[PDB]
Design a protein around this ligand. Sequence first.
Ligand code: EVF
Ligand code: ZN
Length: 258
Amino acid sequence: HHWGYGKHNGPEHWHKDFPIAKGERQSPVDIDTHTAKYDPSLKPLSVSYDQATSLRILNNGHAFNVEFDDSQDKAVLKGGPLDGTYRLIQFHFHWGSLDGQGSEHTVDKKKYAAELHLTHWNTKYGDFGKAVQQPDGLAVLGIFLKVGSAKPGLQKVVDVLDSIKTKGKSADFTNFDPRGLLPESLDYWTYPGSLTTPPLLECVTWIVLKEPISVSSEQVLKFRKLNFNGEGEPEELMVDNWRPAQPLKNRQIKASFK
Ligand SMILES: NS(=O)(=O)c1nc2ccccc2s1
Ligand SMILES: [Zn+2]
């Protein structure tokens, strides 16, 4: 893999190594709020993070991942559009170089400053690597970030970023509670899609919350001090690590709310 978000290896190039990039259920997408139909058959989302066990935070060269112990049913997502039980494995964000861009999904073409992805795998497939090979293998909970008041529950994340500045660096990151990153409402849109980074597998049920969380300018500024590069290499700030909206094609976005 040599893909990224730079001037020569960005999303518009990914199809050359990952031809599924031009596939029929790629993500992210623009959510046209007027066209998304309310589906009264959709259940409330069940987010059960009470026993979530974070372990580590890693700069992987494209984002930072907060990783969870997913060796048993601790932090799970169920309900909503989902059949069965999906286990939290990691979360990460996508963000911009300025507050006017950064999200992957858009809402009536609005870009948010960032987007949080909580990634979960369907336990019926036994492990993450097998789940990503299935059309219903993953459920990603997407949450928009806007800049305003600080998010207190995010500060522990931002304060560790200086210790994982460059690609390949990790730090212990235990006892982090991802419930502190959720908005008040769990109203959502949902559609079938894909991973938004290579290999872009078409294995994701997307659940995108309508209500953004607010973070402070200072918090997002610290995201933007991370580096895509490794230690000692020329500094490339980790910014604009988002894939743009992809064609909706033959898909319906459903709303959980009127
Ligand atoms: N950015 S994301 O769609 O949340 C996501 N991307 C990837 C890439 C590989 C494996 C899992 C995921 S989950
Ligand atoms: Zn993501």
